[PDB]
């Protein structure tokens, strides 16, 4: 089957590293920014007494 019945072009692919730390290699260049795509970073908190 082929693409017509499919909708979106760019799909965020989700993965869980076995590693705490992430390794940039070649054109593998990590980025964080928020305003453009917020949906990746979420900070939450519990106030304490």
């Amino acid at each position: 089957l082929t693409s017509e019945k499919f909708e979106v072009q760019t799909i965020e692919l989700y993965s869980d590293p076995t590693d705490d730390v992430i390794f940039t290699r070649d054109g593998s260049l990590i980025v964080f920014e928020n305003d453009l795509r917020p949906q990746y970073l979420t900070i939450d908190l519990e106030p304490i007494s």
């Binding site: 693409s3 017509e4 019945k5 499919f6 909708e7 072009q9």
Partner: protein, 49 residues
């Protein structure tokens, strides 16, 4: 195609019918393009356009 070969700096692809529509970006043209043309990548054998 028959008419010639030229290189694309990048493509965007947008939606018609749900098949994406690649819109590439090229430098120049060898030969007169045609709606139908027999397409192959200069660099890649695998792909077909």
């Amino acid at each position: 195609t028959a008419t010639g070969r030229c290189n694309v700096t990048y493509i965007e692809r947008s939606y018609s019918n749900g098949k994406l529509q690649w819109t590439v970006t090229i430098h120049n043209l060898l030969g007169r393009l045609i709606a139908g043309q027999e397409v192959k990548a200069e660099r890649l054998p695998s792909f077909e356009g």
